[PDB]
Design a protein around this ligand. Structure first.
Ligand SMILES: NC(=O)c1ccc[n+]([C@@H]2O[C@H](COP(=O)([O-])OP(=O)(O)OC[C@H]3O[C@@H](n4cnc5c(N)ncnc54)[C@H](OP(=O)(O)O)[C@@H]3O)[C@@H](O)[C@H]2O)c1
Ligand SMILES: NC(=O)c1ccc[n+]([C@@H]2O[C@H](COP(=O)([O-])OP(=O)(O)OC[C@H]3O[C@@H](n4cnc5c(N)ncnc54)[C@H](OP(=O)(O)O)[C@@H]3O)[C@@H](O)[C@H]2O)c1
Ligand SMILES: C[C@]12CC[C@@H]3c4ccc(O)cc4CC[C@H]3[C@@H]1CCC2=O
Ligand SMILES: C[C@]12CC[C@@H]3c4ccc(O)cc4CC[C@H]3[C@@H]1CCC2=O
Lengths: 278, 278
């Protein structure tokens, strides 16, 4: 009896690498349903699967668009084993820009995919885990769900929302035998400028391209290998008493300690403004 | 001139009390635009205003539905002074129940009002504040945005979301001279059991009714009057250097410190489960 894993957002990045890590595991103890918003994007997954020699039957692909609870439901029905031992809620969108330049539809989509989409997944799959008295739920988290990042206001809103959702659930789930964990990632190796200028003031326009310069520098320095990140998910699964959070890096725990010394919140604001804008 | 204050969610509660507290101020320092989802519900606001003899012109009402960017824009345009000195984003919904028993449309509506609605407000009013280089924004927060609360998973998601949104913006806004503050409230005074069971499970059912009983007791002991809450808003807007957060109560400091001592979340999840479920 293999451990049945279902993962959202497997076309690229963390989801792709986790899927093939699990499916290729030497023990052959995982059966992986790697789900993608659009099945047409599955090529890279299968290329990576072959590169790691995933055994026949260890990896299957399903269409699962987390905006659509019928898509969620149909994917659940395709789990031939009739159970999910490990649910990985990884699908997510970023959104980068001055707040007032972001389209109202882009803002709503980020919330719908990142927050409501995770709700849809939990509504579909949590009940059977709770009834059975076992199951692991791993949710891809972000440093941006723990501290605010300029020009990522809506992304951060959505990642903070997941902290609140997951923590609230973890309090109830504590003695159910069902274990929810957030995997907190920093950076990971995986509008037009007219529009931005038209939709904001000149000072914000400047600060945005200052931010983009500083963000490329930090990304070059701090972007983790996706294999290293995937392995933290595996560690959380190995744990017999998994914690609510795991961190893929200690790089930001100083900021997190400092942030939480100051209940007023303004020391963080000052420090992060200085770190980003010099 | 007077300080121009625009407040959302003024039909009742915190919004109503703050609107009339500012408009009835003996010094007549404030011109208040009190906004309501539906203008037809303004009767109680005007009764409270007349009860405090709010002078003519100190208080004006507009319809403003935070779900509709056209409503937000139409309200902004009615501000005859052509500026807002203090914006109060107070409009909000609650949602209580086992996650899997909640309708997806109800979940979506909470995030749309509480989170996207606040984004719409900020998108419409920040640009003028940034351009003129001054402005204050006060946002109704919750201790449920700082720590997760069982059976309030979506409400907490939305309150955490406002933490991330506001913190991210505050980093950018420091050198613009536009100040953002969250007013962190504790509790505030304002399906069928077989349906709950059928949609969940035997353990969840027991915990839910345990939660409800315990919650009823905490509301009796700890819930604050909207007037007391309104007074904390007044302090924040009068602060020469306003901080990111103001707390209406110190009652939850212990659980809050429990949370921040242990970033893994273990100490908090255990402590909160013990607090709620005994
Ligand atoms: O990993 P990472 O941090 O490096 O970032 P990443 O590579 O951008 O990963 C995001 C993943 O989430 C998926 N996703 C986006 N919207 C989705 C939806 N509505 N339903 C299901 N999956 C969705 C993406 O697929 P798409 O890129 O095809 O949206 C992608 O596979
Ligand atoms: O006590 P408390 O102050 O904590 O809670 P409360 O009295 O329920 O206050 C919440 C306020 O938010 C408002 N609200 C809800 N949805 C809204 C929308 N789409 N647009 C604008 N305002 C909205 C409510 O108006 P309604 O009750 O009229 O929705 C109410 O005045
Ligand atoms: C804002 C930031 C640069 C950009 C990083 C970044 C970039 C992309 C991303 O998906 C996540 C993150 C999280 C950390 C962010 C940094 C923290 C300190 C700093 O200067
Ligand atoms: C969960 C809780 C009851 C419900 C409270 C509650 C309810 C509604 C709300 O808007 C805020 C809060 C904040 C504190 C919450 C309590 C902490 C300890 C406890 O037993």
């Amino acid at each position: 009896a293999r451990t049945v894993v279902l993962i959202t957002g497997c076309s690229s990045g963390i989801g792709l690498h986790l899927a093939v890590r699990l499916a290729s595991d030497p023990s052959q103890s995982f059966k992986v349903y790697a789900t993608l918003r659009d099945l047409k994007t599955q090529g890279r997954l299968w290329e990576a699967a072959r590169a790691l020699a995933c055994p026949p039957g260890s990896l299957e692909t399903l269409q699962l668009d987390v905006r659509d609870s019928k898509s969620v439901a149909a994917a659940r029905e395709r789990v031939t084993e009739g159970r999910v031992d490990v649910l990985v809620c990884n699908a997510g969108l970023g959104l980068l820009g001055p707040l007032e330049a972001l389209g109202e539809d882009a803002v709503a989509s980020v919330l719908d995919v990142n927050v409501v989409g995770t709700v849809r997944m939990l509504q579909a799959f949590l009940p059977d885990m709770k009834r059975r008295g076992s199951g692991r739920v791993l949710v891809t988290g972000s440093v941006g769900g723990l501290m605010g990042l300029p020009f990522n206001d809506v992304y951060c809103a959505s990642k903070f929302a997941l902290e609140g959702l997951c923590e609230s659930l973890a309090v109830l789930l504590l003695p159910f035998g069902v274990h929810l964990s957030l995997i907190e990632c920093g950076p990971v190796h995986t509008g037009s400028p007219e529009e931005v200028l038209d939709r904001t003031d000149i000072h914000t326009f400047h600060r945005f391209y200052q931010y983009l310069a500083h963000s490329k520098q930090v990304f070059r320095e701090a972007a983790q290998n996706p294999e290293e990140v995937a392995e933290v998910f595996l560690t959380a699964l190995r744990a017999p008493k998994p914690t609510l959070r795991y961190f893929t890096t200690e790089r930001f725990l100083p900021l997190l300690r400092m942030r939480l010394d100051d209940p007023s919140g303004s020391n963080y604001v000052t420090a992060m403004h200085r770190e980003v804008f010099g």
